[PDB]
Amino acid sequence: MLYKGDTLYLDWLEDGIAELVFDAPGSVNKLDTATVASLGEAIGVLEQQSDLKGLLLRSNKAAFIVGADITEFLSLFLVPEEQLSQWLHFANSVFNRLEDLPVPTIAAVNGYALGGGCECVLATDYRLATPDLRIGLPETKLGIMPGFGGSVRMPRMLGADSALEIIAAGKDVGADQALKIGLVDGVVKAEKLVEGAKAVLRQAINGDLDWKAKRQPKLEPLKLSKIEATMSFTIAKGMVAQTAGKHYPAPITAVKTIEAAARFGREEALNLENKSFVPLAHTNEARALVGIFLNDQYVKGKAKKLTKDVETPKQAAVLGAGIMGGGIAYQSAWKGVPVVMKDINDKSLTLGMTEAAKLLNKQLERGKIDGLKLAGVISTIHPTLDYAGFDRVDIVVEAVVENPKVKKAVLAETEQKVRQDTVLASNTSTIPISELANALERPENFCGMHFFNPVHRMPLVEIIRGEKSSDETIAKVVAWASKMGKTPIVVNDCPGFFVNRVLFPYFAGFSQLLRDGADFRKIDKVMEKQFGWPMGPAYLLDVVGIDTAHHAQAVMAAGFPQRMQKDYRDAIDALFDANRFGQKNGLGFWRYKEDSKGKPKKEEDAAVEDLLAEVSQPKRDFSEEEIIARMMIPMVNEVVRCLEEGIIATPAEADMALVYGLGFPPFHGGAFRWLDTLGSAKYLDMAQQYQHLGPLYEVPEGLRNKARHNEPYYPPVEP
Ligand SMILES: Nc1ncnc2c1ncn2[C@@H]1O[C@H](COP(=O)(O)OP(=O)(O)OP(=O)(O)O)[C@@H](O)[C@H]1O
């Protein structure tokens, strides 16, 4: 053969047509730094063969090219801007040489073709795909942008409108959409893919297809009028501004460069893509978004290891079938594991089966599941009032009232209606698992399985290990949590566990701000519009319930009297005593009127200000820095203690718990990512100003040691 590399090879085939195959040593092919180089040597061989009449690009793997190697991304983000620009300029010169070959080219695209993989197939003149194709440029989801001609070829291939939507939103289209749009020239089955991708090629060599007329639009300015240009780009700039006033600069950057690079050739369009990819690759957001992907692949990787030799449970059950019970029953049955949902009255069983069917109805809305086959999974949910079928279940969760007496009572009973080797789980929001373990005969089959509202939207399943929770029981809990399409995390037992434990000091600092005379309406503004929380402290406290927060603040105070007990009377107490419980009864920090569709909207109350002035000092204007610091320091100080105390295993698990459990802003990456993005020693000097407010603002000794040398929590890793 002509050229053989570690990840790809090149050989003659058929009748004077070459064949470049991406055959990586692993399971998926990626355009890593070596593969881009190995491609450069392969194309150069094609440039010195006078007998060349055709070129075919294909893959021996299930997919085509998964993309660039993300394990190199954090290292690529660190090289200086000039060096990264020069490399990207010459990495683009590789694909330009693929595109400029004096020969009809085509890529037989199979399976996935994301990121650099799609940018590769755009260089060829023709593209032929398979019915299982998924193709797109999801580079803005990681904070960067198409760097290998994606923002140049796709706008000139698909028309500006369709390319702006794919690139900015970072989406991938299917086999049917790609042909309709223009990404794909034809769809054939994988068997006929290799042969069919040479039939289209030999139409081109015999002059039937004008291939350099099809190649030409990718080299020329966009065929858009001034009126069409301004129209097309405000739709993209408007659809990007739709996404909640982004702190994310990647989607708007990707759009604005394609706009600036319109009416330009391929050289300047690649130049404007290059000059904007490098600054994006250096943004703290791009590091945090890529760090989330690697941490996600590590969390789910650790999942397969714990669950490597434990069979998944076949029959499941939930105890507590309200809205949360319907979500737990839906999510388990919707992914192939039956459920047994039981309450104490039928009005909750209907309300649970109702909610469980609404979630399936949304799957019927689009991405349709067969309504005939939709009934095949709600029929898998059985609303029982007695203990029917509990003999034939393998695991069960308790999603009952937040009350230790009822939890211990209903756990010891359902234990008796259930076999010995069967596993029990608890969705307690705050009660420690080791305490509930004393009310069971077989504690070795009991642990904490903790969902988060909204259950279907928040994918974290906080899994807590009791003192006698064995290792086999947790693997069964992690196995079921994974099969439900949920991202699980294992923590050690303590009151509040990790997610709800670190969130309370965030609330305590909110009560301490209001006590010092702050405005809860502006505090919610700063935490939502600037830090990026989906909901600020006060608004969130109303959807948790002012009394649920009032009760949870008492549980966390008896568990951590060292530093989680307050001396004064706060907003949570004053609001609770006025029977204002939040969105629950429509009265809380705000007033919640029913809107037209039924989504309660927050409107201001007059009696809430006069009620807060009793528990507060005179109104004091705090800066956004004071608000952000006084709200975030007690939380991150807590997530660090959960690391040193062994509650959470690693910084990667803690950040994924915050991102997927509390909706921690992904562009911040997490508390530890934010703690590394900010100066590790700078954090102590920032926190020393507020160290006198309470023991929560006192940085733990472990971080106080690392702040001596500005030591981070994420070690710089190799790929
Ligand atoms: N003694 C009990 N034994 C078993 N289950 C119970 C008991 N009391 C309540 N439950 C169940 O616990 C679930 C939640 O109870 P409930 O509706 O009282 O929630 P809640 O915590 O009071 O919420 P809110 O305070 O917002 O109304 C319900 O499914 C209910 O059937």
UniProtKB/Swiss-Prot annotation:
Residues 1-189 are annotated as: Enoyl-CoA hydratase/isomerase. Substrate binds at residues 296, 500, 660. NAD(+) binds at residues 324, 343, 400-402, 407, 429, 453. Changing residue 450 to A/Q: Almost complete loss of 3-hydroxyacyl-CoA dehydrogenase activity. The record marks 119, 139 as: Important for catalytic activity. Its EC number is 4.2.1.17, 5.1.2.3, 5.3.3.8, 1.1.1.35. In the N-terminal section; belongs to the enoyl-CoA hydratase/isomerase family. In the C-terminal section; belongs to the 3-hydroxyacyl-CoA dehydrogenase family. PANTHER family: TRIFUNCTIONAL ENZYME SUBUNIT ALPHA, TRIFUNCTIONAL ENZYME SUBUNIT ALPHA, MITOCHONDRIAL. This is Fatty acid oxidation complex subunit alpha. It comes from Escherichia coli (strain K12). The gene is fadB.
